[PDB]
């Protein structure tokens, strides 16, 4: 009963959020705020690097410059290109699923291209790789815009689309678009409250093995 599967890229297809968690927790740790990658998830999930730094100064008065907003983005860029890994079970899932697929992401088109090419996934999605940054300024998830755009490119009504998301903002975006959502907590940056957070945001179900996608989708279709 689904004519389209929409995937997010970061934290779903590619293990990119563990790399952001690593960069950020180290930049925080060095600035006077010791925090492990694991706690990044528990304390700051979803939040932008900018708002995290605002919350840290608010809660602990740690001196944190604007010079450290760009060290993050450029360190992340470099580390993604060198180290980013595909999520386990992606190629298993894609082998089995018969439903058409696309990517709707908040990441820039350039970043998407770089990550997907590296892990060899691009040919399985192009040209159906949609960045919310290309739609306009401030059209980013939790707005439904990117999802509605991807569904319309396939001519699929939103009630016939299932979305795979690891983030609360993507889940709200997808629900706001009238779609059904599978939360995914199998990426390496996951944390104890992750599945509950995804459920609370409107995930119909949560999986931690990408290999479970074919079964979970079939069951959701009834
Ligand atoms: Mg994501």
Q: How far is the CA of 107 from the centre of ligand 1 (A)?
A: 9
CA dist 91 and 188 (Å) reads 17
Structural tokens at position 94: 């894609």
Q: How far is the CA of 26 from the centre of ligand 1 (A)?
A: 21
Long-range CB contacts (< 8 A, 24+ apart) of 177-180?
177/144, 177/147, 177/148, 177/151, 178/144, 179/6, 179/147, 179/151, 180/2, 180/204, 180/220
Q: How far is the CA of 59 from the centre of ligand 1 (A)?
A: 26
CA dist 215 and 221 (Å) reads 10
Method: X-ray
Sheet holding 4-7, edge to edge: 129-131, 101-105, 4-7, 161-165, 180-184, 205-207
Tracing tokens 């609360």 back to the chain, one arrives at 168
Dihedral, 60, 64, 66, 72 alpha carbons, nearest 10: -100
Tracing tokens 């409107």 back to the chain, one arrives at 202
Mark 165-188 as b/e (b = at least 16 C-beta within 10 Å).
Answer: bbbbbbbbbbbbbebbbbbbbbbb
Q: How far is the CA of 67 from the centre of ligand 1 (A)?
A: 26
In CATH terms, the superfamily for domain 17-83 is Putative phosphatase; domain 2 (1.10.150.240)
**DSSP alpha helix (H) spans, the chain:** 17-30, 37-44, 49-60, 67-83, 90-96, 109-118, 132-135, 145-154, 168-176, 194-201, 213-220
CA dist 109 and 105 (Å) reads 9
**Cα–Cα distances in Å, from 8 out to 17, 57, 65, 179, 183?**
12, 31, 31, 14, 11
CA dist 96 and 178 (Å) reads 26
**CATH number assigned to the domain covering 1-16+84-222:** 3.40.50.1000
Backbone torsions φ then ψ of 10, nearest 5 degrees = -60, 120
Q: How far is the CA of 109 from the centre of ligand 1 (A)?
A: 14
Structural tokens at position 98: 């018969």
Residues 6+ apart with CB under 8 A from 21: 37, 40, 41, 189
CA dist 45 and 191 (Å) reads 9
Beta-bridge mates of residue 10: 14
Domain range annotation of the chain: 1-16+84-222, 17-83
CA dist 180 and 158 (Å) reads 8
Give the per-residue SS3 of 162-177.
EEEECCHHHHHHHHHC
Pairing assessment for the beta strands 101-105 and 129-131 based on DSSP bridges: parallel
C-alpha closest to that of 103 among 165, 175, 48 = 165
Tracing tokens 């990119």 back to the chain, one arrives at 16
With vertex at residue 95, the alpha carbon angle to CA 125 and CA 128, rounded to the nearest 5 degrees, is 10
CA dist 151 and 96 (Å) reads 21
Q: How far is the CA of 65 from the centre of ligand 1 (A)?
A: 27
Backbone torsions φ then ψ of 85, nearest 5 degrees = -115, 145
Pairing assessment for the beta strands 161-165 and 4-7 based on DSSP bridges: parallel
User: Within a 13 Å sphere around the CA of 102, how many CA atoms are in the beta-carbon half?
Assistant: 21
Taken in order 105, 106, 109, 110, the sign of the CA dihedral is negative
| Resolution stated for this PDB structure, in Å | 2.0
- SS3 of 7, please? strand
């Amino acid at each position: 009963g689904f004519d389209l599967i929409i995937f997010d890229c970061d934290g779903v297809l590619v293990d990119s959020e563990i790399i952001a968690a690593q960069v950020e927790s180290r930049l925080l740790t060095e600035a006077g705020y010791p925090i492990s990658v694991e706690e990044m998830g528990e304390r700051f999930a979803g939040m932008t690097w900018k708002n995290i730094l605002l919350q840290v100064e608010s809660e602990a008065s740690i001196p944190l410059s604007a010079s450290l907003l760009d060290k993050s983005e450029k360190l992340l860029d470099m580390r993604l290109e060198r180290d980013v890994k595909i999520i386990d079970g992606v190629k298993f899932a894609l082998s089995r699923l018969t439903t058409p697929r696309c990517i709707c992401s908040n990441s820039s088109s350039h970043r998407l291209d770089m990550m997907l090419t590296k892990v060899g996934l691009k040919p399985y999605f192009a040209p159906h790789i949609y960045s919310a940054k290309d739609l306009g300024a401030d059209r980013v998830k939790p707005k439904p815009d990117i999802f509605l755009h991807g569904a319309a490119q396939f001519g699929v009504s939103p009630d016939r689309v299932v979305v795979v998301e690891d983030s609360v903002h993507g889940i709200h975006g997808a629900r706001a678009a009238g779609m059904r959502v599978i939360g995914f907590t199998g990426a390496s940056h996951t944390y104890p409250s992750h599945a509950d957070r995804l459920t609370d945001a409107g995930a119909e179900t949560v999986i931690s093995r990408m290999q479970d996608l074919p079964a979970v989708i079939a069951a959701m279709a009834e």
